[PDB]
Amino acid sequence: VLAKELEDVNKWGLHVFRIAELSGNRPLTVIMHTIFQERDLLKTFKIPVDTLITYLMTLEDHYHADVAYHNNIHAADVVQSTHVLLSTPALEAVFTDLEILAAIFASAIHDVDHPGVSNQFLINTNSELALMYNDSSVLENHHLAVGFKLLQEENCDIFQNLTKKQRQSLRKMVIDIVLATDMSKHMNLLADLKTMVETKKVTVLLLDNYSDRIQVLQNMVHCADLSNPTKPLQLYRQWTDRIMEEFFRQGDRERERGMEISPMCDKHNASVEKSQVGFIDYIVHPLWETWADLVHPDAQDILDTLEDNREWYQSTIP
Amino acid sequence: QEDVLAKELEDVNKWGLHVFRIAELSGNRPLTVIMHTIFQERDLLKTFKIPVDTLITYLMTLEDHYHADVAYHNNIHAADVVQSTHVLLSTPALEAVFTDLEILAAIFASAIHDVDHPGVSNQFLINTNSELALMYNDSSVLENHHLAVGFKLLQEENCDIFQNLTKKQRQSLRKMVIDIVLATDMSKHMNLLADLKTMVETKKVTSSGVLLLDNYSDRIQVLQNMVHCADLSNPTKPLQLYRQWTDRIMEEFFRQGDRERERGMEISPMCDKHNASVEKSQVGFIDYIVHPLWETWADLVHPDAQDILDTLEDNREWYQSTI
Numbered sequence: 001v002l003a004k005e006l007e008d009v010n011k012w013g014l015h016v017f018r019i020a021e022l023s024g025n026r027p028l029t030v031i032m033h034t035i036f037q038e039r040d041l042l043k044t045f046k047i048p049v050d051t052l053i054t055y056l057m058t059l060e061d062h063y064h065a066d067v068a069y070h071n072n073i074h075a076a077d078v079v080q081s082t083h084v085l086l087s088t089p090a091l092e093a094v095f096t097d098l099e100i101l102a103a104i105f106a107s108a109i110h111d112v113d114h115p116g117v118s119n120q121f122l123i124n125t126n127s128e129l130a131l132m133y134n135d136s137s138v139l140e141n142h143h144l145a146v147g148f149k150l151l152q153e154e155n156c157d158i159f160q161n162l163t164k165k166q167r168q169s170l171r172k173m174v175i176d177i178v179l180a181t182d183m184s185k186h187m188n189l190l191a192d193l194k195t196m197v198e199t200k201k202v203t204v205l206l207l208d209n210y211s212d213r214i215q216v217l218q219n220m221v222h223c224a225d226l227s228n229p230t231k232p233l234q235l236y237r238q239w240t241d242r243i244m245e246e247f248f249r250q251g252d253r254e255r256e257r258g259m260e261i262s263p264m265c266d267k268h269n270a271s272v273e274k275s276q277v278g279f280i281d282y283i284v285h286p287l288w289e290t291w292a293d294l295v296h297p298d299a300q301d302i303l304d305t306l307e308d309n310r311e312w313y314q315s316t317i318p
Numbered sequence: 319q320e321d322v323l324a325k326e327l328e329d330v331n332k333w334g335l336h337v338f339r340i341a342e343l344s345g346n347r348p349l350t351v352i353m354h355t356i357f358q359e360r361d362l363l364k365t366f367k368i369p370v371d372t373l374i375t376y377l378m379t380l381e382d383h384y385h386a387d388v389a390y391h392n393n394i395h396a397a398d399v400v401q402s403t404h405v406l407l408s409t410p411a412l413e414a415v416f417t418d419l420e421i422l423a424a425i426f427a428s429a430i431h432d433v434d435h436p437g438v439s440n441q442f443l444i445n446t447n448s449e450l451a452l453m454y455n456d457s458s459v460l461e462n463h464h465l466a467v468g469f470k471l472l473q474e475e476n477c478d479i480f481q482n483l484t485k486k487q488r489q490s491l492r493k494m495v496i497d498i499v500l501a502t503d504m505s506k507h508m509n510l511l512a513d514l515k516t517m518v519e520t521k522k523v524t525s526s527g528v529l530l531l532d533n534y535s536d537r538i539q540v541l542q543n544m545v546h547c548a549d550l551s552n553p554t555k556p557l558q559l560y561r562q563w564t565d566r567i568m569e570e571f572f573r574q575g576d577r578e579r580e581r582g583m584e585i586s587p588m589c590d591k592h593n594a595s596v597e598k599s600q601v602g603f604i605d606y607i608v609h610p611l612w613e614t615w616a617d618l619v620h621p622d623a624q625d626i627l628d629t630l631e632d633n634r635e636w637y638q639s640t641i
């Protein structure tokens with residue numbers, strides 16, 4: 001039953017696809033609602049639960065059901081992954097309840113209205129989105145704008161009972177977190193994380209200034225965004241299938257328009273498995289090794305699964 | 319009359335061009351006629367194969383999208399920044415330094431750098447939960463908008479003045495223009511000025527004695543600060559020009575403050591027509607913003623800008639003498 005699967009809401013590797021099916025393609029709504037109850041967020045911020053559900057449904061509706069990866073299931077997955085990373089013991093008592101709400105809300109909206117093509121595609125096709133956003137974090141700026149504008153629909157302002165200062169602080173943190181999910185910022189984000197681990201102070205990690213605390217929240221949601229290869233293989237393999245479909249559909253549009261095919265987007269010359277191994281070796285493992293170092297060692301189980309999954313994918317390559 | 323306008327446009331290479339008289343003589347088209355004059359002067363139509371009717375059509379559409387009912391951030395301000403940037407480009411310290419494409423980018427960025435400005439600040443737009451601030455996530459809200467509108471108008475009928483640039487030329491120009499206009503966000507001024515000071519302290523010059531700028535970062539930084547200086551050049555102009563710009567920015571500030579007061583908001587600095595000192599605010603503006611910026615630019619191009627800096631210091635003393 002849907003209720004039984006949700007008991008694992010606090011566990012890495014929740015059966016996200018089964019929850020999507022058992023909720024009638026509403027995992028973002030049911031999982032966000034469950035997170036808000038587990039962290040006592042409706043009462044702490046006086047969010048009418050009907051307003052929460054109405055916003056959540058409207059937000060889920062603006063994820064595209066015909067986009068194979070960047071849809072409402074991905075959003076639900078990043079939300080729940082973030083939720084688990086927030087309860088890392090080494091980050092215990094680090095973030096305020098407003099910051100926790102910030103990270104979770106940001107996770108929920110961080111890909112809304114994604115068209116299934118990359119920023120570079122939007123720039124190179126002279127899209128309306130790239131013209132609006134001057135080629136800079138084109139998607140991420142749009143995800144934020146849509147995620148905030150939907151708060152203005154009827155009975156959707158889940159922040160109505162926040163103070164004016166709380167709303168302003170929340171809005172800034174959400175913007176800083178979602179802008180950091182732009183993959184063109186990964187290396188800089190990683191470097192900041194590495195610097196934090198070399199200068200790491202511990203009693204449990206002590207982060208005194210907002211600059212360091214938002215840095216952790218950015219890398220956290222970024223880690224959640226790039227957490228597919230750290231999940232149990234059966235979940236990882238479905239995410240791989242979905243991202244390859246989206247990449248191949250983008251490559252068909254690049255091909256039909258006569259554009260240079262983006263990396264991993266040519267269905268006629270792609271090694272799905274080799275790309276996964278390179279994705280892990282160059283992006284996901286460096287990131288999660290640093291995150292694990294930061295919270296040494298509450299992430300060892302995550303790092304272990306990632307390395308198991310990398311081993312398995314390598315073994316599929318003759 | 320076109321004869322009188324033609325005479326006034328003979329000053330287009332001069333600091334302190336009568337830009338308000340050109341606005342009146344051109345039938346409120348200072349941006350169109352000054353851009354057209356400058357493109358003719360720099361041979362840009364021939365260099366970039368820009369059809370004259372396309373240039374005029376774009377310019378008129380662009381000028382149309384400045385607000386005629388905003389006292390400062392209007393098409394006269396845009397024409398002024400264009401013309402000032404045009405003079406700064408000709409400074410001896412930069413002779414043969416920038417390519418035709420970079421000159422085109424700086425001048426085009428100046429022309430569009432405030433288009434569709436509503437006459438209120440970024441902070442006002444953020445604080446009132448404006449659609450603009452919601453679109454741009456509170457980050458360089460106006461400046462992102464000026465760019466988006468300025469580029470979008472190139473798509474209107476017979477408006478693509480870059481139709482004959484190669485694809486890489488358009489790509490390069492687009493990025494430079496974005497880099498330059500985003501740097502006109504006043505919240506970037508301190509970091510921009512800090513970088514300019516570092517460049518001055520580490521400046522290299524070539525055999526001919528011009529600035530050596532051998533990488534994108536340095537070249538774009540000079541163009542960013544050039545256009546920023548032009549944008550903040552009002553107090554460096556002959557006093558009769560400067561005082562008109564002061565009258566206009568203050569009217570715009572006071573109208574914002576009226577909206578803030580009516581909304582029960584705290585009034586922004588310099589926006590309260592009942593607790594304002596025009597003269598002290600100009601002196602603080604020069605002392606904390608304009609003179610540190612222009613003194614640094616003058617150091618970068620020394621001694622090319624000494625007369626402009628002298629005028630700025632004279633005008634500062636004049637305003638101070640009225641307190």
Ligand SMILES: COc1cc2c(cc1OC)[C@H](CCc1c[nH]c3ccccc13)N(C=O)CC2
Pocket residue numbers: 183225228229239240243264275276278279282283
């Ligand atoms: C499950 O597998 C994937 C998941 C995701 C991606 C790629 C996957 O598998 C190859 C790409 C990575 C984009 C990317 C940017 N720089 C890179 C450098 C190397 C590799 C990829 C990238 N995403 C796009 O939104 C995030 C989700």
Ligand SMILES: COc1cc2c(cc1OC)[C@H](CCc1c[nH]c3ccccc13)N(C=O)CC2
Pocket residue numbers: 504552553563564567588599600602603606607
């Ligand atoms: C001719 O006079 C003016 C012209 C301009 C301004 C102010 C003027 O006069 C006080 C303001 C400056 C805003 C500003 C940002 N930080 C500051 C610190 C101190 C003072 C002002 C500012 N502008 C607004 O678009 C640019 C043009």
Ligand SMILES: [Mg+2]
Pocket residue numbers: 110111139181182
């Ligand atoms: Mg994204």
Ligand SMILES: [Mg+2]
Pocket residue numbers: 431432460502
């Ligand atoms: Mg401006």
Ligand SMILES: [Zn+2]
Pocket residue numbers: 074078110111181225
């Ligand atoms: Zn994502």
Ligand SMILES: [Zn+2]
Pocket residue numbers: 395399431432502549
């Ligand atoms: Zn301006």
